[PDB]
């Protein structure tokens with residue numbers, strides 16, 4: 175378990191900066207050298223390489239990578255070079271700036287990050303952009319979906335693990351009676367239970383719900399709700415039960431079928447490589463009976479593929 | 490299931506003719522009597538009432554209804570009095586005579602009627618007007634849309650149900666590769682598959698298409714085509730999968746939002762009352778979470794409303 179990318183042995187930031195300068199200097203690029211260094215260092219080490227590049231090369235590593243590289247390869251490398259919290263912050267801003275909101279990106283990040291990470295994200299977003307994340311969410315999404323995202327962003331959830339069996343039963347009972355008639359869905363109920371109860375409590379509510387309804391909570395969420403609100407509730411449930419399997423499903427859906435959602439593919443591979451990619455891989459193979467490696471290999475190409483395959487770790 | 494309007498018990502054509510004559514004779518009209526008779530008889534019985542009116546009243550029932558009644562109420566009653574095939578024939582001619590072609594009416598009828606009905610329509614159109622339906626379609630529509638309508642009109646479709654799994658896969662595969670690039674849509678492909686394959690084959694192609702592309706065929710039709718050609722392909726797909734839901738959507742779109750398309754409202758309610766109105770109602774409520782009855786009641790008024798509500802059957 176854990177991630178694929180780890181801190182390098184023999185790490186020499188100045189030498190790595192020299193390798194990267196040699197790779198980019200003059201016409202042409204040695205992409206293999208860029209990959210061979212950066213995909214073999216963790217995020218913290220990459221920042222030390224940025225620092226060493228500035229002082230020993232007298233140039234800006236991020237500017238140089240941006241100018242040298244293009245398209246999806248450039249996106250993966252620049253994402254790799256970005257500090258963890260700022261990467262999340264940048265991806266949320268990109269999902270909202272304008273436009274036709276990337277609601278799936280909002281859900282993926284806000285449902286899956288831990289409370290201290292969400293706090294850091296809120297803080298950094300405001301510092302960087304001079305606007306609150308919550309305010310931007312309110313302008314760019316609406317209705318029940320909007321209420322879910324605001325709750326995740328504010329941290330409207332109990333962070334302890336107190337278990338009252340009687341309260342677990344009433345929550346499950348509440349969700350059951352709500353499933354009784356087609357007009358009877360109480361989305362406010364769903365929102366409140368799924369966004370406010372602590373993780374232990376919720377894992378127990380899911381077990382009790384199955385017991386009294388004979389249905390998994392996910393089944394009823396799908397039958398009873400729709401749209402981005404449904405997707406948001408499903409992501410909270412999945413991230414509570416098995417976060418690596420949540421990400422394995424995001425990866426699958428970004429590649430399977432007609433077209434490729436490279437922006438999601440890239441973001442998940444970059445953001446999870448150091449955390450739980452080994453787990454994501456195992457869950458992917460359990461769920462889909464194919465390796466994640468093989469999906470990446472069959473759905474991408476070029477240097478873009480080469481670097482994704484290292485973030486994947488292999489097989 | 491089936492329709493709302495059925496053959497009346499105790500049917501006495503002469504008495505009905507007397508009731509209708511009394512209702513119209515002299516200044517003023519008893520619209521409730523006209524509705525109470527005609528909306529409670531089926532189309533075949535209405536023709537027997539026309540016959541009885543001629544011989545026992547010595548007048549022409551259709552002329553008298555036309556002179557007495559006006560606007561949308563008159564349109565529903567005269568449509569009700571018209572033999573099934575001639576009603577279709579009249580509606581197609583009305584959609585084309587002149588002008589700025591009612592392309593939606595052409596699609597609705599030609600995509601939804603069964604082959605023997607299309608044959609009867611072609612025959613009756615030529616007899617009545619001295620022009621072929623296909624020729625009028627060619628003069629009044631163009632391009633790919635025109636090719637679709639001509640195919641539906643000629644009956645260019647296999648009417649058997651032979652299923653070759655290998656041919657189902659290649660059709661789906663063909664539609665997939667076509668969805669790969671923005672310039673890669675092969676509308677000829679779409680036309681040929683959707684207009685020529687038999688219904689069993691096609692229902693299997695839709696399932697396989699979803700499997701290999703992860704998209705419903707309707708989604709790709711919308712992203713890949715536009716205009717009346719898109720609408721025509723969507724109507725063929727919907728009529729293959731769930732014809733009552735096709736009509737429930739026509740009704741919805743004729744009433745929802747700004748304005749009312751009474752000509753479509755009337756034509757669908759008249760033409761489907763004896764066939765599948767109970768199914769249309771159920772699909773309407775499933776799709777829109779409101780009864781069809783309530784839409785009619787909230788969007789029409791007067792005697793026009795009264796008769797539509799009986800064609801709807803109620804709630």
Ligand code: NA
Nearest residue numbers: 198200201202
């Ligand atoms: Na260069």
Ligand code: NA
Nearest residue numbers: 513515516517
């Ligand atoms: Na009169």
